Design a protein around this motif. Sequence first.
Motif, short mmCIF file in Angstrom:
data_model
loop_
_atom_site.label_atom_id
_atom_site.label_comp_id
_atom_site.label_asym_id
_atom_site.label_seq_id
_atom_site.Cartn_x
_atom_site.Cartn_y
_atom_site.Cartn_z
N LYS A 6 -0.59 3.13 5.78
CA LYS A 6 0.65 2.44 5.52
C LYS A 6 0.47 1.30 4.55
N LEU A 7 -0.79 0.87 4.27
CA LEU A 7 -1.10 -0.22 3.38
C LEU A 7 -0.79 0.12 1.94
N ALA A 8 -0.95 1.40 1.55
CA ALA A 8 -0.65 1.89 0.22
C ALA A 8 0.83 1.81 -0.10
N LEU A 9 1.69 1.76 0.94
CA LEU A 9 3.13 1.70 0.85
C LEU A 9 3.60 0.26 0.77
N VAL A 10 2.78 -0.71 1.24
CA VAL A 10 3.08 -2.14 1.19
C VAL A 10 2.99 -2.64 -0.23
N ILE A 11 2.11 -2.03 -1.06
CA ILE A 11 1.86 -2.40 -2.45
C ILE A 11 3.12 -2.34 -3.29
N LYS A 12 4.00 -1.34 -3.03
CA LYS A 12 5.12 -1.01 -3.89
C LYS A 12 6.31 -1.89 -3.58
N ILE A 85 0.24 -9.03 5.53
CA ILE A 85 1.43 -8.30 5.15
C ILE A 85 2.61 -9.21 5.36
N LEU A 86 3.29 -9.58 4.25
CA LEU A 86 4.43 -10.46 4.27
C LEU A 86 5.66 -9.63 4.52
N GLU A 87 5.92 -8.64 3.63
CA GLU A 87 7.05 -7.76 3.70
C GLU A 87 6.51 -6.36 3.82
#
Length: 98
Positions: A6-12, A85-87
């Motif tokens: 799920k971290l790869a999805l936080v990037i965007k 993780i902020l958002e």
Amino acid sequence: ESINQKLALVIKSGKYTLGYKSTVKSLRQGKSKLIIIAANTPVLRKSELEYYAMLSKTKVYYFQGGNNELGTAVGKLFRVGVVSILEAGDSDILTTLA
RNA sequence: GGAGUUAUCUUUUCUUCUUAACAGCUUAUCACCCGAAUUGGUUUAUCCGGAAUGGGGUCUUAUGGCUGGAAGAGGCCAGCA
């Protein structure tokens, strides 16, 4: 879901930040909603990010693998101790507990 | 500054002279730049720095050089009684 997926999805759409000083900010003022803490994060400075998270009552994800597994999940070479993780954004890390 | 060589010949040719404790001034390495966005360093570099970030932010050691002591002292070499 594991959090490294799920971290790869936080990037965007979401936002993250890496670092001890970066997470210290985010737990004190409370801009982080969920932090991640790895395995081989240094002695004193790991324990403080557990402390300040329990203090402000921000949530902690205790990770499975080490700093290398956590670092590849974001995107740098170094031994990433924490991901703040902020958002969320596109990440399904919110709907793990439903 | 001093002398052109016993033998043909030589004054930009050779030789001698050409120096000095200490204190103040103030450099490489290290680490709260751990932490780490970034990338100075032949570079593989996660690293550490121009450059940027916290909490409110910076620092030690130290070849050499610069400055003071030295108003004064020595010395190529000469002048007088």
